[PDB]
Every structure is written in structure tokens, then in C-alpha cells.
């Protein structure tokens, strides 16, 4: 398909959009040394 639409702002705020995204931080990467397999999540 094809989509046409608009994201727009008033000053610094991206107030206009069909979809909005708001990440919550305080991308966390950790090592999990479970058993013999210290993988990264």
C-alpha cells in the first residue's frame, strides 16, 4: 500500500499526528549469566 498524512508542531511540540510515540526512559542492555550462556538482552 501507500499512506499519505501529516505530523506537525506548535513551537517545539509535535501536537499533530495520526500516531503519536512517547518513549519511557528513566534502550536498556543487560547480560544474563544464566547457566553457561551469558547472553545479552
Amino acid at each position: 500500500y501507500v499512506i499519505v498524512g501529516v505530523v506537525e508542531n506548535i513551537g517545539e511540540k509535535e501536537i499533530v499526528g495520526s500516531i503519536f510515540y512517547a518513549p519511557y526512559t528513566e534502550f536498556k542492555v543487560v547480560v544474563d549469566p544464566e547457566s553457561l550462556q551469558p547472553s545479552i538482552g
Binding site: P33, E34, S35, L36, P38
Partner: protein, 113 residues
Amino acid sequence: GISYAAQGLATGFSTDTTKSVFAGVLGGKYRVYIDQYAKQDYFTVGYKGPNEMDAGIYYAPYVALTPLRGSDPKNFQPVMGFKTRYGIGINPFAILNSLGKNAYFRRVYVKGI
């Protein structure tokens, strides 16, 4: 006693046992080591020059005694260990070209002991 059993340790009542290295030199010529995993009974004679390229067999460690660590939440028991990466090989003489072929070594099966 040219080939040793570390008799000094025996004398001192096992002050060590050091059971990991070549025992000593037979004939004043051959450095001799115990195969602690020998399957039947045997000896192998081999040559080694001072040059690392004159061994006939190679072991070329990349990683050695690197610790491993962690924990098991099922019971929260520790995980500890060791890894190595070394590789082996021989003077090609052409593994398939190794079996019974490497001139640097001669293996004799021993019976009657």
C-alpha cells in the same frame, strides 16, 4: 633416578605430588612423561628441535584458562569455570594425513609388564 618421581616429596610425606609434568630424562637423552590416560600400555618416542617449526606437532593457544562465571536462579547456585581455544596440528607429511604417518614420532605397544 634420572627419571623422577619427585622422591623429595615422597621423603617429606607428600609435600606435593606434582602429577602433571615430564618426570625426567631417560638415558640422559629422552625427556619422559606419563600418559595418565594410557589405554593399554605403550611408549612413543618423538623428536623436537629448538625451533618451534621443528616439532612435528603443534599446539598454538589463543585463549587459555579464561574464567567463566555466573549464577543459576533455580536454586541460586554459583556458576564458575574455565575456557580455552588452542587448536592442534602436525607437520603435514602428506588428520587424515596424520594417522600412522608422522615421522617425528614412533609408537610401540608394550606387553608382558
